[PDB]
Each structure stands twice: as C-alpha cells, then as structure tokens.
Amino acid sequence: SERIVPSGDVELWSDDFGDPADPALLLVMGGNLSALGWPDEFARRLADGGLHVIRYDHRDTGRSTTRDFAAHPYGFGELAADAVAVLDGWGVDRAHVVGLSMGATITQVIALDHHDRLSSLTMLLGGGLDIDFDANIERVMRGEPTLDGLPGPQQPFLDALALMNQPAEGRAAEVAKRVSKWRILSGTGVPFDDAEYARWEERAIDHAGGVLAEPYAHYSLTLPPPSRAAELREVTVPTLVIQAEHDPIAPAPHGKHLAGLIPTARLAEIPGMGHALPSSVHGPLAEVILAHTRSAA
Template sequence: MTERMVTSGTARLWSEDHGDPGAPPVLLISGDCQSALFWPDEVVTALVGGGFHVIRYDHRDTGRSTHRDFAANPYTFDDLTADAIAVLDAWDVGAAHVVAFSMGAGLAQLLAVDHPHRMLSQTLICTHALGIDFADNVARALAGEPSRDGLPLPESRVFEALELHAGPSADRSAELDRRVEGWRIMAGDAFDPAEFRRREERVIDHTGTLHQSIAHGYVTEGIATRGADLARITAPTLVVQAPLDPISPPPHGRHLAESIPGAALVEIPGMGHALTGAALDALLPAILAHLRR
C-alpha cells in the first residue's frame, strides 16, 4: 500500500493504492461526506485478490484531504468529478474501472458522460440517475410533499434521525454511538453494530477529529439538469439496487439502469444504504463478474 497526496485545483486529496500497479485499475469513489475508509477492507482485499489495482481517496472535506468552510469556498459536483480525474492523473492511470456508492455514483455518471475515455466500466451502487433533483426531493420529503418525477422520495426519518446539521458529540464514545445509530437506520437487514463501530473508529483515527463534515450536503450544482446525457454513456454499466435503501428506494436503480444503454441491474436482497458484511457477500461476486466482463 502506498499513500499519495493529490492536488486538484486548490484542494489537496489524500489517496492510497493496493495491489499490483500493472493490474487493471479500479477507482473507488465514496458517498457524500465519506472518506476513503467508507470502503471496507474486505472490498479492497477482494478486488486485489481478483487481480485488480485498487485506488481509493478522501473526498475534499473528508478524511485527510483539505477541509474548508463551504460557504467561503463553495464547489460543485463538476469540481468533485474533477477531483476523481486528478486522482487518476496522480496515479498515472489513463482509464479505470469505477466502483462508486451513492453521491460517488453520481460523480461516476458525470465521469462516464464528460470523460468517457477515462472509464473502462462503472458500477453504480445505491444511487439515483442524473436528472433527479435530490436536494428538492429531500425538501419535499421533509415537508410531506409528493415527488415531482413519480419516483419515490428519500425517507424523511433518515434526515430527521441523523440530525444532519448537528455538531460532533462531546466525546469519542458518544460520537461513535451517534454514527452507529445513523448506520442502523440506513443499513437494512443483518446490521452488526460492532462492525460499524470498528469502521467508524478507523475513520475517526484516519481523520484525526470527531467532527464529521456535512459540506457535501450543500453541493447542488451539476447533476439535476443532466438526465438526458445518460443516453450517451458507452461504458459498460452495472447498477446495484438495494431493496431497503431509504435514500434511493426502488425503483430508482431500475430507472437508472433503463436510462443507460446496455446497463445491467442487480438487486442485493436485504441491502440498505450501507455496505454491511452480509450485503458484501452477495455484492462482491457481482462486482467482480462485471469487472471481468
């Protein structure tokens, strides 16, 4: 494993790689407000064992990457997409398989549309299509209003329970309790609190602070108007639908897969908006099969 700091505009991004640099590259893109360590080591180990060179990185405002006040230093989804390109450039990767989760899978869609030569394939996990106005959907869910597009809204209980705008807890144990409870709400079946407590322990150690940035929640530009562009995607695409996902509930995955030419859809039974150990047992073989195709 090698660590590398990457410059993207005015941001510095922490990244690391695993496996043989000569093997086919896989770029892991985390969800919103999640560092590289969102991806459990089981994912990295399986991909390296499958013959791939794995790169993961901290989004800006997460982990060991640049942290700034968003109001004074705003950015867009296009900027976050440029961050992914900067990571590929820093690791001398011309094109990669992209495996992405939630907001990261939105960035992957932008990569596939705007930088098709940088993508070998994409795996889009627990997300919605370009063209979906997620910020408006959240507002509608909290207000008890119906969806504009006929697709289900996120479940308001998620945002109410997580108290997205609350600061960090007073001590490490309380902060871990808060984060684990947040994952419990999102994770679906077979949730193991000890598993997620261990993961969040590592995230806090990696970041060096109890504070968990919510900056990505303020990013609104770059996705909601791009729906028609999905028809131009040529990268082989696997869409993963989690039937118990409270953020992008079914049939968001099917809608996304039907919007991308030739995309395949797989549903992972019992999965919510999290990478539980139980979900990985079914998810990892599906990802590896897609990458090998």
C-alpha cells in the first residue's frame, strides 16, 4: 500500500512490502533518489525474509514536497527527522533502518538524534560523519590528499558526473543515460543487466509523473560537521556496515572506518559489488541484512 505522511512543513510519499505485522525495516535512499531507487524486486526479497519493508521519497524527490531550496533551506537534521516521520506515519515505534550512500549519512544522524526509534542500523555505500566528502571531491580533482587519509572518490565517480552533464532529449534517451550512469558506478565485478535497470528507471520516471529531470535539491546540502563522528561512540543498537568491494565513491576501507566509529558495529563485504543495486547482489545483500535484523530481535 502507499500513503502520504506529514513531516513538519513537507509531505512525504511512502509505500511498503510484506506483512504489516512483521518487524519494520525502513529503507533510506541516497541523495536525489526517490523510493524507486530501491528496486521493487529488492524490497520484495528483503520483505519475504520476514520484514515489513517501508521505503519513501526524500523531500525534493518523487511525489514528496518539492520546493526551491534557496527559499527554504534544510540539512541532514531535516532529512533524518523526515525518516522518523515516516515511522510515525506507519505507527512504527522502532525500526531496522538501512541507509545507502548519502542515506548512510542520514542514518548516522538518526542514530545520534533519534536513537530511541531504532531496532538496528545498517549502512552501505557510504562512510563516516568525519569524512569531509564534498571537500574530498574537490581535493581528488586537484590531486590533493584527503585530510582523513582514506581514499577519495575514484575515476568511475568522476565519469558518472561527466555523463550526468551530457544532454538527453526525450524519455528513451533519459532512461539510457541513467542506465549508462549506473553501469559505470556498478562496475564489472558483478553482473549488470541493462534491461532490468532500464525498467527500474522507467518506474522511477513514472513515479515522478513522467518528469525526465532528476532531482537536484540535495546538491545544495551541507554535511554535518566532523565533530559529530565522536558522538557515535554512544550508539548501542546493533550496527551492520556493508562495504561494496569495488565501491568507486566510498572505497575500502571506508567501511571499516565507519564500523570503527560505533561500538556495536560489525563489518561485511559484498565481493565484486560497486555503487549500484543490480539484481546479482540482491540475494547476498538481503541475506546479510536479514541475518543482522534477526540477531537484533
């Protein structure tokens, strides 16, 4: 089913998978990505393990309130509170939360400021609050080292940004362009199927009322200050950090480092995986998440 839930001065679209009586699992997408950034088939695979999977559209994506950012600025505090508002909107007291990419940053803020709403935490394709990510993009382009000493974003990330700059006229061209971006980010370490990713983007575009432009508000966000990383030492819910082996945006050992910030964190690695969700990794991802959520209950 689907519902629109209130969150302060925005309204958030959300839908679910699985039995409403199973333990809640909240999926938190990356930046500029709507609910449909989580493929339906992945959400189903997770739910069919015994979870009530809920996903939603961040503000400024999908069918959620979309606004001129300059006139109404917000940050990760709002993005985290919105995630909790989705739990409120489904009557969920505590949820297994899964944060992906920029969503892992959102979920670290949930862990700090809404810890009471967590059954467990899972983060993948991201890194710690002490990683000055936007500054690191600038540094890698100039050939300067990151100040954290961990690897910055790699060439496939830069390539994906370059493709995102190229024009696409019409729906077919937009879908092909988006698929080409995911193919670059996924890499070749696991099987990538263009047809399945095309269908997933067709659904994402349909979900956005057929509009072809990607969301862009989240490019205006400012990250939490690195001081907040130290606060993660107080987190006590079971935490799983998943490293995609060949992640071009947050390469190893980002994962390990993020896990090292949280006393209850355990690290897993998906062999061959890049910064994308081809169906080739749905089984492995669902397996490790389900084992984790089971141990937290």
